[PDB]
């Protein structure tokens, strides 16, 4: 009976979704002028790393970056001068995520150690120091983004997300509902609700205040690797191993676009939008990064400049540049 | 021209020097991905080193070994086994006193897209009590296709053949060994294997392999 109740609820949810799907973006974007051929070139190269780079994150000042690499060094870069203004030795070199605080005062990093490390930058003593260790996850840390200088939310490899109070280090609000382990995590511009992407091919929206899932989206065929909110917070795109990215809308509560092309047979590592939200930048396994016109799913250009897998991707808050790290141990900043 | 930011440039160069020194020190170490099933013998192996992920380390005969034991993590391995690409070798171990899960795992990882050219040091652990299990429990129940006697050495050889058959490429080698539940020599076996591996990598860098 209860299984039948669940099946009936799923069926009526699907029926309501079909009723709400009066059109698709493909037939409404028939009058939009495409972005054309995007020709981009590397403007900076950060070649201080010594092994694979898994994570990066720009700064809200749009000048300083943070990079996480297998070398065990979390080095803050000067994107204009190429100076390495800071260099943090990690307690564990198995790092796949990093975060730069919106104020720039703090920086977060984590990985297979199940711990999100919060490092204080504006230290009175002059050296970068760990402020507190975020522990409690039973799975590996996959992504983490700051709400402010005190609140951070961390994705994990145990199908759960957690929102942290850095002052106490406890789990202010824990998140459950994914059936597979979670790979990505991104925050809305209003910072009132976020989404997470898990290997169960499902991306779902959560409330930071109460932890209740607000809209669960499905449609992917394989594991979700990356998610980025649209600049308005009313949509987000997902990155998956199936060589396809898909766009989900919160109000429509259903998938809206799928970014596919037969020439790609490899998964997406990281995804992010531009400032206007027209460009969807996805890092791929085949050594290159494509640019996706989020309104038309067009492949407007290729950011092919890495000798190995491009893994991490971030875009300036000013919209000036995108930096794509890779396993080639070199970052690259583009325009 | 440059302002007093020359001091920032000097700090950047100092950071570069420190990073280069740290990397030169790090490349001196040998990275090993310890691996296997639950209770297969990874814990015993790191115990014999005499010292989420636990990166057990030890030094032996002028080499610095780091055992990256990733068996304490219950998660999909397809999302984090790539973190261990470009290690010196894999110390994958199995339990003879089990089994099909170990064979499936070895087929998945020995032929993984990241370890297709990475040597694997297969340790058939738990030899002493498997020597009693073979007498008490016929191996035919563990391997229905086993067309051979129930004597010990041939059963061990049959398990060796079943494990070694999983390789699909001619550019990788598998160093099978038996831990015999006493060890005190697996350090030497690992040392010989990683010596061959580092010599091969040196040859490849020099074009000799």
């Amino acid at each position, epitope marked *: 009976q209860l299984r039948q109740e669940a099946e009936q609820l799923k069926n009526q949810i699907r029926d309501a979704r079909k009723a709400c799907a009066d059109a698709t973006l493909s037939q409404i974007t028939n009058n939009i002028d495409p972005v054309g051929r995007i020709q981009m070139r590397t403007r900076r190269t950060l070649r201080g790393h010594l092994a694979k780079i898994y994570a990066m994150h720009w700064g809200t000042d749009s*000048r*300083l970056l943070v990079s996480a690499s297998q070398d065990g060094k979390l080095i803050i870069w*000067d994107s204009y*001068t190429t*100076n390495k*203004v*800071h260099a943090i030795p990690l307690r564990s070199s198995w790092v796949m995520t990093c975060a730069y605080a919106p104020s*720039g005062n703090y920086v977060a990093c984590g990985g297979l150690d199940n711990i999100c490390s919060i490092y204080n930058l*504006k230290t*009175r*003593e*002059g*050296n970068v120091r760990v402020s507190r260790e975020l522990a409690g996850h039973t799975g590996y840390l996959s992504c983490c983004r700051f709400l402010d200088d005190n609140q951070i939310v961390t994705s994990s490899g145990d199908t759960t997300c957690a929102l942290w109070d850095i002052e106490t280090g406890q789990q202010t609000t824990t998140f459950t509902g994914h059936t597979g382990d979670v790979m990505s995590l991104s925050l809305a511009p209003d910072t009132r609700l976020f989404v997470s992407g898990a290997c169960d091919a499902s991306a779902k929206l959560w409330d930071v205040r109460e932890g209740m899932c607000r809209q669960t989206f499905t449609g992917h065929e394989s594991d979700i690797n990356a998610i980025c909110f649209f600049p308005n917070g009313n949509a987000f795109a997902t990155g998956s191993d199936d060589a396809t990215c898909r766009l989900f809308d919160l109000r429509a509560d259903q998938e809206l676009m799928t970014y596919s092309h037969d020439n790609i047979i490899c998964g997406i590592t990281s995804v992010s939008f531009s400032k206007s939200g027209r460009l969807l930048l996805a890092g791929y396994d085949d050594f290159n990064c494509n640019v996706w016109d989020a309104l038309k799913a067009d492949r407007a250009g290729v950011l092919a400049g890495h000798d190995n897998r491009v893994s991490c991707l971030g875009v300036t808050d000013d919209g000036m540049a995108v930096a794509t790290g890779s396993w080639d141990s070199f970052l690259k900043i583009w325009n | 021209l440059s*302002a*007093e*930011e*020359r*001091a*920032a440039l*000097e*700090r950047s160069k*100092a950071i570069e020097k420190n990073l280069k020194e740290d990397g030169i020190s790090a490349a001196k170490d040998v990275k090993l991905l310890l691996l296997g099933a639950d209770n297969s013998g990874k814990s015993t192996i790191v115990k014999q080193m005499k010292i989420g992920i636990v990166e057990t380390h030890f030094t032996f005969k002028n080499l610095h070994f780091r055992l990256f034991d990733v068996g304490g993590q219950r998660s999909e391995r397809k999302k984090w086994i790539h973190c261990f690409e470009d290690v010196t070798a894999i110390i994958f171990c199995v339990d003879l006193s089990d089994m099909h899960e170990s064979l499936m795992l070895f087929d998945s990882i020995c032929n993984n897209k990241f370890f297709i050219d990475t040597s694997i040091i297969l340790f058939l652990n738990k030899k002493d009590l498997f020597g009693e299990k073979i007498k008490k429990s016929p191996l035919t129940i563990c391997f229905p296709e086993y067309t051979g006697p129930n004597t010990y050495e041939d059963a061990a050889a049959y398990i060796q053949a079943q494990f070694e058959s999983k390789n699909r490429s001619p550019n990788k080698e598998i160093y099978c060994h038996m831990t015999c539940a006493t060890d005190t020599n697996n350090a030497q076996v690992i040392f010989d294997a990683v010596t061959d591996i580092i010599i091969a990598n040196n040859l490849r860098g020099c074009g000799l392999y």
Partner: single-chain antibody, 230 residues
Framework: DVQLVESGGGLVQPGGSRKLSCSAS????????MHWVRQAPEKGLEWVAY????????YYADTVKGRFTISRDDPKNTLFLQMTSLRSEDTAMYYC??????????????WGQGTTLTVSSDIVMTQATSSVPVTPGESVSISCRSSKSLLHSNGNTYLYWFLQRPGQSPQLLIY???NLASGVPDRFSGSGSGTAFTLTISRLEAEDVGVYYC???????FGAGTKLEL
């Protein structure tokens, strides 16, 4: 907490020589490009020495070049400034100055207690007033001028503001003329451009009584000093 205590001062016969030590504690001295500056008993501050991180870059004053030498011993966390052939113009209280240089950093963010030493194309900073009367809760504007433009082509303007309380050590208020230094109340503020500068203070208290110096950091220089009193 950060501390800088110096030693090696006292009485020196004319023509003599001695070395001054800056014992550092409470911070990672190895990555700090410490300075050493002095103040005559009835004059403004003046630049003397500068040693970079790792002892890779060093400069001295024009009246001191080839006459003194600055040394850094990082493992012992001590800064050395050996002075040779002391003259009548070298008597002063010497302040060890802490500094670290990266983007968004606060140079000159800490100063030492000081040691008295007694004997028996340059950019010049000028202050139009030496002393003005102030009242608590009022608003004042303290200004100083520079001979050369402090605004670099990259947009940064290298002007710094310091306050000298009576019987105390100078403390940084504003670095790069706009960014208020850590540990200072928001009451202070800085503004200006090109060759003219000013410091805007509102809601003054007794803690603001002192002498205000301004320093330019564009090229290898303090002002005269403006005193506030009731």
């Amino acid at each position: 907490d950060v501390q800088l205590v110096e030693s090696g001062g006292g009485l020196v016969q004319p023509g003599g020589s001695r070395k001054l030590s800056c014992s550092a504690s409470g911070f990672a001295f190895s990555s700090f490009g410490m300075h050493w500056v002095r103040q005559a008993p009835e004059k403004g501050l003046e630049w003397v020495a500068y040693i970079s991180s790792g002892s890779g870059t060093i400069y001295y004053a024009d009246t001191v070049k080839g006459r003194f030498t600055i040394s850094r011993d990082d493992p012992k966390n001590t800064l050395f400034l050996q002075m040779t052939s002391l003259r009548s113009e070298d008597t002063a209280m010497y302040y060890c100055v802490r500094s670290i240089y990266y983007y968004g950093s606060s140079p000159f963010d800490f100063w030492g207690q000081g040691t008295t030493l007694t004997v028996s194309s340059d950019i010049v900073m000028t202050q139009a007033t030496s002393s003005v009367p102030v009242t608590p809760g009022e608003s004042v504007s303290i200004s100083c001028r520079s001979s050369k433009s402090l605004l670099h082509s990259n947009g940064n303007t290298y002007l710094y503001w310091f306050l000298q309380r009576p019987g105390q050590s100078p403390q940084l208020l504003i670095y790069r003329m706009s960014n208020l230094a850590s540990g200072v109340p928001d009451r202070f503020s800085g503004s200006g451009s090109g060759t003219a500068f000013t410091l805007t203070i509102s809601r003054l208290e007794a803690e603001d009584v002192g002498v205000y110096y301004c320093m330019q950091h564009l090229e290898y220089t303090f002002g005269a000093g403006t005193k506030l009193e009731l």
